[PDB]
Amino acid sequence: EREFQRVTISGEEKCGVPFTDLLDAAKSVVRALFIREKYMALSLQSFCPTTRRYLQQLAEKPLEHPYEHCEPSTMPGDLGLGLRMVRGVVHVYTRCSEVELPYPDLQEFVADVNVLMALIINGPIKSFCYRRLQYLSSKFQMHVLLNEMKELAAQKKVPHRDFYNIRKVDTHIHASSCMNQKHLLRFIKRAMKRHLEEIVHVEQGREQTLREVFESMNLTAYDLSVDTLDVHADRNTFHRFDKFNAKYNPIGESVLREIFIKTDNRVSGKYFAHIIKEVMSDLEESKYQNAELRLSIYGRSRDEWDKLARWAVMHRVHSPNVRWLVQVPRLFDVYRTKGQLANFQEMLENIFLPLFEATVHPASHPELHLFLEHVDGFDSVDDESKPENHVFNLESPLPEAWVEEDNPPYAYYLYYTFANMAMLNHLRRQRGFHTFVLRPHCGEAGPIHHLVSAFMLAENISHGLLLRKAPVLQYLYYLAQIGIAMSPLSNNSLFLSYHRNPLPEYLSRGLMVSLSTDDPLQFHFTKEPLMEEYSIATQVWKLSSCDMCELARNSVLMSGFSHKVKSHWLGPNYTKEGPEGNDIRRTNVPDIRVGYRYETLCQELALITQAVQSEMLET
Amino acid sequence: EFQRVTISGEEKCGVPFTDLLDAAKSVVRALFIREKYMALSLQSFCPTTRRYLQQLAEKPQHPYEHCEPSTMPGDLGLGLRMVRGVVHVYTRRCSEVELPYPDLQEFVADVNVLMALIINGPIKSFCYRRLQYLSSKFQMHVLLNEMKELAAQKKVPHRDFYNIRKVDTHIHASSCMNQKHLLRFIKRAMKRHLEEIVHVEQGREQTLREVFESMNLTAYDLSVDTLDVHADRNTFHRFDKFNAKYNPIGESVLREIFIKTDNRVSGKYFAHIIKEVMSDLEESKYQNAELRLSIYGRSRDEWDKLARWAVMHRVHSPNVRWLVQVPRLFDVYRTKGQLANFQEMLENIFLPLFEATVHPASHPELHLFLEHVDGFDSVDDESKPENHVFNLESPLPEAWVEEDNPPYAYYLYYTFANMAMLNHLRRQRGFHTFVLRPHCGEAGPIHHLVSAFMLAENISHGLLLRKAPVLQYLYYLAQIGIAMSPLSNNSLFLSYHRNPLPEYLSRGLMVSLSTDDPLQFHFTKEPLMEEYSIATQVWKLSSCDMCELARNSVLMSGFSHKVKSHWLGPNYTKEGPEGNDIRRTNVPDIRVGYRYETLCQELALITQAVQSEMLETIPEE
Amino acid sequence: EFQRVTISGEEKCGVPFTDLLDAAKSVVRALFIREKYMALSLQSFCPTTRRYLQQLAEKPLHPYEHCEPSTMPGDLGLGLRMVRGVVHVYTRRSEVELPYPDLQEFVADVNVLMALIINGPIKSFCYRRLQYLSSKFQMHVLLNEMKELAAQKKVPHRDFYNIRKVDTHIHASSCMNQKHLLRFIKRAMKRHLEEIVHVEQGREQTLREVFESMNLTAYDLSVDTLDVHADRNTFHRFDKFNAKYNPIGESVLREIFIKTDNRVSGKYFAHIIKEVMSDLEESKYQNAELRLSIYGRSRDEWDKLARWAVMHRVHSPNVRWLVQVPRLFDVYRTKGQLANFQEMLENIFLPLFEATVHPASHPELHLFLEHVDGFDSVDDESKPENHVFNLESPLPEAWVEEDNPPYAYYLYYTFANMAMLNHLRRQRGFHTFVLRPHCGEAGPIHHLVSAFMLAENISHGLLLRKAPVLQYLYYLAQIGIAMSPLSNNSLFLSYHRNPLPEYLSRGLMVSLSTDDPLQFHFTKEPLMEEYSIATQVWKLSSCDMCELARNSVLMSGFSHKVKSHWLGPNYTKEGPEGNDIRRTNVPDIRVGYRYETLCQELALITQAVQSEML
Ligand SMILES: Nc1ncnc2c1ncn2[C@@H]1O[C@H](COP(=O)(O)O)[C@@H](O)[C@H]1O
Ligand SMILES: [Zn+2]
Ligand SMILES: [Zn+2]
Ligand SMILES: [Zn+2]
């Protein structure tokens, strides 16, 4: 079905506030969106087409097996370009003259931040945005009451298509925890038998086999249990992210984490690759389920990228249902305190210089060149509840000058990851290579202004719980249609209770939200964590079938999968805006639901933009 | 060892001795009523409760591989006749066999006492305070002992939640398969055989494809949405809509073909679906189910027809136990002229069972099938109002010819009365006895829980205990098992955050988790694991709590003593910590010890109050 | 006597000794930090906490009718000079040996406490103890509430209506309800028809003329017209709440009626307060601790405030004065009204030091300070902070930027100057002051760290529910918390989310207050209205209500003589010995339970530490 009952408001002041208040909010909202659009364009990241169309009216200028063979000889040739990091950003040179890439200006970024920082504490704008957010919830409630039967009928009438055969993407999941506890326990106990003489660990210079590792712990294969591994988050982990980090060590053993959960170890990440490929097998068996695993590049060593690429190539860690995102833990303070890094610039060099070198000279890093074909972007992870005592501004030390053992704040990490990524994408675009996106963890806990940083620089975010405390930011995320990969089960076990999770309000109000498992090892109990994640949410918040499919469609849209794959998944016209881009035959989402979302977004954007043009100045 | 919370003072219940004495006398009297009827029907009664009551009491090879009637036990030549709704056994098919035939007047008298009890305000407040105390003590116990409980679970070798026995204590066979599983089975059937005749419409024979062609539905076009067998939010407080979910694609014919045991194809499709589910339980090893099979009492041959269906299709599994449900649809049958009177329905349900016990060769397939049948169930929309109170003025079953459906207590009493006599006869021959495990307290009148408290070994749902403190207090003291299905409740009557399950578990009531109807509610391929997950996440249950629920499920189950000996250990019959082995249960003795002591202390509080008065009444007379 | 709950076991606290020992050492260290600064500033410290800490440290732990400067104490000829933001006293106008605070020591103490509040292992321990206290109280009530009520019924005469209740946290500018303000305004418009109340762009206007410009008559005026009451639109909009201080959205009307300094010399504002004082005196048992504003903008504010009170006889036996300093340095610096933060400090403290040294120089202030008990800090606490107060922070004289100094910056220098003032006043036998700031309502949690070190007691304290170690430390230290659930319901935290029942259940010294009756309450008795709603919503018992009233009196700044008359001569005793049901209507069962619970918790922490010291 396509036609549906529509809610309309008649009379003057349709927004419920006097025009003077509306104009003030509109000016700030439009300016904020322009700021985000600028940096998305700068970094070659996506910006909502619907938002861009409405903003163009007020815009001065126009807007907008693979690893079987690894032969460097057939790879693209060397461009001979020189590389050097200047003030925390990689610069490209002809060999010599600087290549005119749009190198970000820090002062411009700081000025933009200050505008948003003042905006998020603007009282009058806060009330206006909160009123609009309540309006969106009220309108959606009316839409459901007057059209859910019609929406259900459309789902019923579609042939062949149901929730079990629509595409679903685990938009936010970590490789180190992609397996369930029982799966990990079985894999370890199988490994204790198959190969028995291989040296798997060196303890104080003493080479040890896996059996000798377990005998040192006074543990037998029979004695091992899920409780023994102790890798599951419990109620005592709540508000204790440090205790959650400890769950990554089985049996409280860093050696077991090294052997089975690390890509780089004495076994060349043999066990970790095998477990991932087993997870890949389950994903391929399910056909319709996909995941975007997070692999760790710590930036501690210059060789991490090459070793990670070789690890994937040698073990053939690849699947059509898996896309890779590289996460950078914010652990500079730990590294600096141990003397393993000289300055924050060295950490940035270990993260981006190998990438820049691979682009200019693919044969220089042949394994990395192949691996990057499946790497979509960067992620930033750390205990986001930790306080920040340093404000990122022009007075902050540059990365080369940052030699103290203090961890730079969240915005410091994000800006330099963004700045280097933006230049890298420009270089890779010129050669026709795949570009990257920035998809950080944001809003889970800690200062609200972390969401200001992501709004400026992030393609999409994960968690985003604190948007409920910032009406203007939540309103902007809706207007910009910024994807949010949420993990209610993870939040329930760490920060925010399930019944208080803001996901229901985000979904009702039209934010592009998707469901994710985060760390199935520490949380889920079934053999299909993503289905279990969908189950709990659908029951506790009593989500309708249309709501479930809408979440699945959102997960695909915010994923890093290629256009060709998405064309098969959602249809060749999926890139179109509104109902035109939706095919119920492939998504099981009625056009009535998509139509309502598109009209609601268009109405909201029209309200803000038309208010700006309606201002009358007096000489 | 674990930290124990102790009270110090003169009155440690919180109430004046007069309030304690009044409540204690009624509670003890209520417990005696239940003990009398459990003994009458050879049903289990909490050993801990009985021991405290005694102080106040003046009285002290596939099983279906072969079917050879000749090798079966011989005929005892006993006559059978239903008298006033209860079967009587006779020496010849002649004297009446001296069996404890229930007296209805005695039953009504006990009911009236309990009905007055459940509205006693002073007693209600007393029990409510005790329930709050039980919750408070558990909260302090958890705070002061959860770390020690967790350490014990870490210490025990090999044992974890994934290798402990879990029983789906309440699940219906007609809905034991998930929606995706049913869709795949239907799609496969359409491909395989056009030979099968599945349905006759107006005397016109039709095949499976022809039936689907009439609806103009192709195999490819079919989807889970087309089946519409899933309970959505529109089913909330709409049990009639849930009834409609039993029809695939909203068709009764499809339900008969795939979901029913008696049809043109001898229920082969339903048997295969069950046996496919049974395979998964065997693959999981540690997961078991108690599927509910329907005996409607509509036809005298239903028991034989159900037994032949199991024997011919070899529907058996070591991880599956059978409980037979009797839908309360006498009004539907009577209105259609299918039963003469309610007595005929009882005879259709119980006469074949008595005859099989007396003369196994008369019902050779029923004799084999009953080896895996453990008890009876009563299912219907419990929200439906009742206009008739079951009393001596109520028509006897043979006299009940009106099309009105008898009330809940009417069904339960006569199911109980006939079951008790059947158990006595089966015990004489050494055969397995039965128990009465009805759906109770999900919705509707509170007094339904009064009926089950008297006659039921355990119940399912039991949500309304939260609205009757005295009944919830009694169920705790009697340790009456409660099979709860929180997901089913979320889509039908009560939301997850309002569900009283966490309060029941904390206060010490014997609660277990169940799926009810996986077809209409669950989304994953392991519904029971999905059920445990949601409950653990919403109520932040610990590993100890999860394992304690699994232990309760086994204890509430109908599995044999030998089976439970391997599952829970040879000494599982012992009360308190002595009966618990973490090496098989993963439940720390700290948890079991706390429960056992709390139950004994509560019984001691009530028992001493009764003793005190009788001591002080001696001078008075 | 009452049924008591006892714990038997090897680990009675619920955690292994190693976890207990680590938490106890930090908890003991934190308590010593507070005791050090309370002693330095001559502020109270919980006697029960001190006794258990001593074992761990051998070192010991009408008044305004006549104003005659000649009769006042003579001049000591002592010099005064700000030194790094703190007033220093000199023998003439050598340095007087006063315990001048050391900033480096303060910063070092802060860093330790800041680390403690983000220590995961200690946070879980404290949270577990907090849950234990709630569980223990739950069990206590279940078994003893009947006995507590029986004592209340048996005690002669005393009930909730004849026990003393003190509004421990209320602002003078909002101490009247909206209907009271409306009646007063209409009354004034019919009086003093020939008197200038305001000049509008060089045009003198009388009270009637001001209303003529607004096109409003006395009849037209209504409660709606004033628009001084908060509503659902005021939620999380403290700026809108400040706007409510302007009747009819007019700053002039606020100036005429709700300010002590104006053309009419604060005539109307004094009269309204006296009307409230009269209502308080008629009630006999209800008291208040009103907040008066000293902005620190001008050097003469203290003298002008004291003159206002003396001339209009703004005094009541049921009222104690606390002086609030709005954190508005940014506004003053931006407009050029101040050059640096030290000037703000000079305007706030120098007149007080001068009055102490030479009372005859500030004769009105000398009399007025007899009824002033302490200082207060007020501002939109939800505002973020981008500057951390440490040794690298500018000194007050060097702070010239328009940025508002952080909360700790205000609190430390107010604490430092106040402490020296108290030492001087004690030498002369004058009344000393205490620091009672608004804290924990919103904004950063570390504000509660600052008040824990420097504040006698706090108001609001809502964020303690998010900081287990801080709430556990406040409980052990028995820091008074003045809570205003109705105010929070209309500003930050809804009534059903208010942590007051948890604090009261766990034994924290909590009291009920109205905060701003003008913007919040509807009835003729805002304090009674505040108590009633708390009782109904949380189903508080008569014992719970009376315990709150007793806590309010104990937190208050009323004299020892008055409190002895109120709570009895022995009220200073600890535990049940200090409670008289005939005076408080609080059964000794309740007081006994609180005392035993507090002592047991303190013993657990202290005895665990002693084992390492033994
Ligand atoms: N979980 C249930 N609750 C209530 N009535 C039920 C349930 N299951 C089956 N019934 C009733 O039993 C009859 C059908 O049995 P069956 O075909 O096995 O599903 C119908 O009258 C249903 O209303
Ligand atoms: Zn994550
Ligand atoms: Zn059921
Ligand atoms: Zn205040």
Short mmCIF file of all heavy atoms in Angstrom, two decimals, chain A residues 201-232:
data_model
loop_
_atom_site.label_atom_id
_atom_site.label_comp_id
_atom_site.label_asym_id
_atom_site.label_seq_id
_atom_site.Cartn_x
_atom_site.Cartn_y
_atom_site.Cartn_z
N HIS A 201 53.24 -19.93 23.57
CA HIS A 201 53.48 -18.83 24.48
C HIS A 201 54.89 -18.96 25.05
O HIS A 201 55.40 -20.07 25.24
CB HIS A 201 52.44 -18.79 25.61
CG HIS A 201 52.76 -17.82 26.70
ND1 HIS A 201 52.36 -16.50 26.65
CD2 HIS A 201 53.43 -17.97 27.87
CE1 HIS A 201 52.78 -15.88 27.74
NE2 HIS A 201 53.43 -16.75 28.50
N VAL A 202 55.51 -17.82 25.33
CA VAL A 202 56.81 -17.75 25.97
C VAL A 202 56.64 -17.03 27.29
O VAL A 202 56.24 -15.86 27.32
CB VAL A 202 57.85 -17.04 25.08
CG1 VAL A 202 59.21 -17.02 25.77
CG2 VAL A 202 57.94 -17.72 23.72
N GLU A 203 56.94 -17.72 28.39
CA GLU A 203 56.80 -17.19 29.74
C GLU A 203 58.20 -17.02 30.33
O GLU A 203 58.88 -18.01 30.59
CB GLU A 203 55.94 -18.11 30.60
CG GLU A 203 55.78 -17.65 32.05
CD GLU A 203 55.04 -16.34 32.18
OE1 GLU A 203 54.48 -15.87 31.17
OE2 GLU A 203 55.03 -15.78 33.29
N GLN A 204 58.61 -15.77 30.53
CA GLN A 204 59.93 -15.47 31.08
C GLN A 204 61.02 -16.15 30.27
O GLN A 204 61.99 -16.69 30.81
CB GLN A 204 60.01 -15.88 32.55
CG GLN A 204 58.89 -15.31 33.41
CD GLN A 204 59.00 -15.72 34.87
OE1 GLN A 204 59.83 -16.56 35.22
NE2 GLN A 204 58.17 -15.13 35.71
N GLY A 205 60.87 -16.13 28.94
CA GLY A 205 61.81 -16.79 28.06
C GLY A 205 61.65 -18.29 27.97
O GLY A 205 62.50 -18.94 27.35
N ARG A 206 60.60 -18.85 28.55
CA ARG A 206 60.36 -20.30 28.54
C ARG A 206 59.27 -20.60 27.52
O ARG A 206 58.10 -20.28 27.75
CB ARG A 206 59.97 -20.79 29.93
CG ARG A 206 60.99 -20.47 31.01
CD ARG A 206 60.58 -21.05 32.36
NE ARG A 206 59.94 -20.06 33.22
CZ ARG A 206 58.64 -19.81 33.26
NH1 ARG A 206 57.78 -20.46 32.49
NH2 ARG A 206 58.17 -18.89 34.11
N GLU A 207 59.64 -21.22 26.41
CA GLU A 207 58.66 -21.62 25.41
C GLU A 207 57.69 -22.64 26.00
O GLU A 207 58.11 -23.59 26.66
CB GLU A 207 59.36 -22.19 24.18
CG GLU A 207 60.02 -21.14 23.30
CD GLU A 207 60.69 -21.74 22.08
OE1 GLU A 207 60.75 -22.98 21.98
OE2 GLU A 207 61.15 -20.97 21.21
N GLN A 208 56.40 -22.43 25.76
CA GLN A 208 55.36 -23.25 26.34
C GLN A 208 54.36 -23.69 25.28
O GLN A 208 54.03 -22.91 24.37
CB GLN A 208 54.61 -22.50 27.45
CG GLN A 208 55.42 -22.26 28.70
CD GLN A 208 54.63 -21.50 29.76
OE1 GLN A 208 53.52 -21.04 29.50
NE2 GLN A 208 55.20 -21.38 30.95
N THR A 209 53.89 -24.92 25.39
CA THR A 209 52.79 -25.41 24.59
C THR A 209 51.47 -25.07 25.28
O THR A 209 51.43 -24.71 26.46
CB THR A 209 52.90 -26.92 24.36
OG1 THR A 209 52.79 -27.60 25.62
CG2 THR A 209 54.23 -27.26 23.72
N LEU A 210 50.37 -25.20 24.53
CA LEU A 210 49.06 -24.86 25.09
C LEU A 210 48.75 -25.70 26.32
O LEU A 210 48.23 -25.19 27.32
CB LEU A 210 47.97 -25.04 24.03
CG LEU A 210 46.57 -24.58 24.43
CD1 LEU A 210 46.56 -23.10 24.78
CD2 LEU A 210 45.57 -24.88 23.32
N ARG A 211 49.08 -26.99 26.28
CA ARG A 211 48.88 -27.84 27.44
C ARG A 211 49.68 -27.33 28.64
O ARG A 211 49.17 -27.28 29.76
CB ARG A 211 49.28 -29.28 27.11
CG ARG A 211 49.86 -30.08 28.27
CD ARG A 211 50.17 -31.50 27.85
NE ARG A 211 51.09 -32.16 28.78
CZ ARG A 211 51.52 -33.40 28.64
NH1 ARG A 211 51.12 -34.18 27.64
NH2 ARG A 211 52.38 -33.89 29.53
N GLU A 212 50.94 -26.95 28.41
CA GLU A 212 51.76 -26.44 29.50
C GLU A 212 51.23 -25.11 30.02
O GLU A 212 51.38 -24.81 31.21
CB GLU A 212 53.21 -26.30 29.04
CG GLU A 212 53.84 -27.63 28.64
CD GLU A 212 55.23 -27.48 28.03
OE1 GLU A 212 55.54 -26.38 27.51
OE2 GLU A 212 56.01 -28.45 28.08
N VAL A 213 50.61 -24.31 29.16
CA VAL A 213 49.96 -23.08 29.62
C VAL A 213 48.84 -23.41 30.59
O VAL A 213 48.69 -22.78 31.64
CB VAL A 213 49.46 -22.26 28.42
CG1 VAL A 213 48.63 -21.06 28.90
CG2 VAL A 213 50.63 -21.78 27.57
N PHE A 214 48.02 -24.42 30.26
CA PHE A 214 46.90 -24.78 31.12
C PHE A 214 47.35 -25.51 32.37
O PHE A 214 46.70 -25.40 33.42
CB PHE A 214 45.89 -25.62 30.33
CG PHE A 214 44.96 -24.80 29.49
CD1 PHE A 214 45.18 -24.64 28.14
CD2 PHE A 214 43.85 -24.20 30.06
CE1 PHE A 214 44.32 -23.88 27.36
CE2 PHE A 214 42.99 -23.44 29.29
CZ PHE A 214 43.22 -23.28 27.95
N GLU A 215 48.44 -26.27 32.29
CA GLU A 215 48.96 -26.92 33.49
C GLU A 215 49.56 -25.91 34.46
O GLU A 215 49.50 -26.11 35.68
CB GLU A 215 50.01 -27.97 33.11
CG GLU A 215 49.42 -29.17 32.38
CD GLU A 215 50.49 -30.08 31.80
OE1 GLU A 215 51.51 -29.57 31.32
OE2 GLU A 215 50.30 -31.32 31.84
N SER A 216 50.13 -24.82 33.94
CA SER A 216 50.61 -23.75 34.82
C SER A 216 49.45 -23.12 35.59
O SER A 216 49.64 -22.64 36.71
CB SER A 216 51.35 -22.70 34.01
OG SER A 216 50.46 -22.00 33.15
N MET A 217 48.26 -23.11 35.00
CA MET A 217 47.06 -22.58 35.65
C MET A 217 46.33 -23.64 36.46
O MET A 217 45.29 -23.33 37.05
CB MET A 217 46.11 -22.00 34.60
CG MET A 217 46.75 -20.95 33.71
SD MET A 217 45.59 -20.23 32.53
CE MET A 217 45.31 -21.60 31.41
N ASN A 218 46.85 -24.87 36.52
CA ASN A 218 46.20 -25.96 37.23
C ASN A 218 44.77 -26.15 36.74
O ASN A 218 43.83 -26.30 37.52
CB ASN A 218 46.23 -25.72 38.74
CG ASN A 218 47.64 -25.74 39.31
OD1 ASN A 218 48.13 -24.73 39.83
ND2 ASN A 218 48.31 -26.88 39.20
N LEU A 219 44.61 -26.15 35.42
CA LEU A 219 43.32 -26.33 34.77
C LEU A 219 43.41 -27.46 33.76
O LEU A 219 44.38 -27.56 33.01
CB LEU A 219 42.86 -25.05 34.07
CG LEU A 219 42.47 -23.88 34.96
CD1 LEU A 219 42.19 -22.64 34.12
CD2 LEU A 219 41.26 -24.23 35.81
N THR A 220 42.38 -28.31 33.75
CA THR A 220 42.24 -29.35 32.75
C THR A 220 41.16 -28.96 31.74
O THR A 220 40.40 -28.02 31.95
CB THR A 220 41.88 -30.69 33.41
OG1 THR A 220 40.48 -30.71 33.73
CG2 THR A 220 42.69 -30.89 34.68
N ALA A 221 41.12 -29.69 30.63
CA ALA A 221 40.08 -29.44 29.64
C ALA A 221 38.70 -29.68 30.22
O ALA A 221 37.76 -28.90 29.99
CB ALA A 221 40.30 -30.31 28.41
N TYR A 222 38.54 -30.76 31.00
CA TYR A 222 37.26 -31.04 31.64
C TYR A 222 36.90 -29.95 32.64
O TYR A 222 35.74 -29.53 32.71
CB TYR A 222 37.31 -32.40 32.32
CG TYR A 222 36.02 -32.81 32.99
CD1 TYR A 222 34.98 -33.37 32.27
CD2 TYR A 222 35.84 -32.63 34.36
CE1 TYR A 222 33.79 -33.74 32.88
CE2 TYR A 222 34.66 -33.00 34.98
CZ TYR A 222 33.64 -33.55 34.23
OH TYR A 222 32.46 -33.92 34.85
N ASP A 223 37.88 -29.49 33.42
CA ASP A 223 37.59 -28.49 34.45
C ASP A 223 37.11 -27.17 33.85
O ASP A 223 36.33 -26.46 34.48
CB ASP A 223 38.83 -28.25 35.31
CG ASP A 223 39.22 -29.47 36.12
OD1 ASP A 223 38.58 -30.52 35.96
OD2 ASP A 223 40.18 -29.37 36.91
N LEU A 224 37.56 -26.84 32.64
CA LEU A 224 37.19 -25.57 32.03
C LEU A 224 35.68 -25.47 31.87
O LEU A 224 35.01 -26.43 31.48
CB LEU A 224 37.87 -25.42 30.67
CG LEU A 224 39.38 -25.14 30.71
CD1 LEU A 224 39.99 -25.33 29.33
CD2 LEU A 224 39.65 -23.72 31.22
N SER A 225 35.15 -24.29 32.17
CA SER A 225 33.73 -24.01 32.01
C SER A 225 33.58 -22.55 31.61
O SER A 225 34.54 -21.77 31.64
CB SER A 225 32.94 -24.30 33.29
OG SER A 225 33.30 -23.41 34.32
N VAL A 226 32.36 -22.18 31.22
CA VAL A 226 32.08 -20.78 30.90
C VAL A 226 32.38 -19.89 32.10
O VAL A 226 32.90 -18.78 31.95
CB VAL A 226 30.63 -20.62 30.42
CG1 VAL A 226 30.25 -19.16 30.33
CG2 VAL A 226 30.44 -21.31 29.06
N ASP A 227 32.05 -20.36 33.30
CA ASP A 227 32.37 -19.61 34.50
C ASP A 227 33.87 -19.45 34.67
O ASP A 227 34.36 -18.39 35.07
CB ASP A 227 31.77 -20.30 35.72
CG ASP A 227 30.25 -20.46 35.63
OD1 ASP A 227 29.64 -19.92 34.68
OD2 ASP A 227 29.67 -21.13 36.51
N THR A 228 34.64 -20.50 34.35
CA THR A 228 36.09 -20.42 34.49
C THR A 228 36.66 -19.33 33.59
O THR A 228 37.54 -18.58 34.01
CB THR A 228 36.72 -21.77 34.16
OG1 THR A 228 36.15 -22.79 34.99
CG2 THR A 228 38.23 -21.72 34.38
N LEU A 229 36.18 -19.25 32.35
CA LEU A 229 36.64 -18.19 31.45
C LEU A 229 36.29 -16.82 32.01
O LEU A 229 37.08 -15.87 31.90
CB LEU A 229 36.04 -18.37 30.06
CG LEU A 229 36.34 -19.70 29.37
CD1 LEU A 229 35.78 -19.68 27.95
CD2 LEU A 229 37.83 -20.00 29.36
N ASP A 230 35.10 -16.69 32.61
CA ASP A 230 34.69 -15.46 33.27
C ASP A 230 34.75 -14.27 32.30
O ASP A 230 35.18 -13.17 32.66
CB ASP A 230 35.54 -15.18 34.51
CG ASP A 230 34.98 -14.08 35.38
OD1 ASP A 230 33.84 -13.64 35.12
OD2 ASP A 230 35.69 -13.65 36.31
N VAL A 231 34.32 -14.51 31.06
CA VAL A 231 34.34 -13.49 30.02
C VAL A 231 32.95 -12.90 29.78
O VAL A 231 32.74 -12.22 28.77
CB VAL A 231 34.93 -14.04 28.72
CG1 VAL A 231 36.31 -14.63 28.96
CG2 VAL A 231 34.00 -15.07 28.10
N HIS A 232 31.98 -13.20 30.64
CA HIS A 232 30.61 -12.71 30.50
C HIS A 232 30.35 -11.54 31.44
O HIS A 232 30.66 -11.62 32.64
CB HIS A 232 29.57 -13.80 30.75
CG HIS A 232 28.26 -13.56 30.05
ND1 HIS A 232 28.04 -13.91 28.73
CD2 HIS A 232 27.10 -13.02 30.49
CE1 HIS A 232 26.81 -13.59 28.39
NE2 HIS A 232 26.21 -13.05 29.44
#
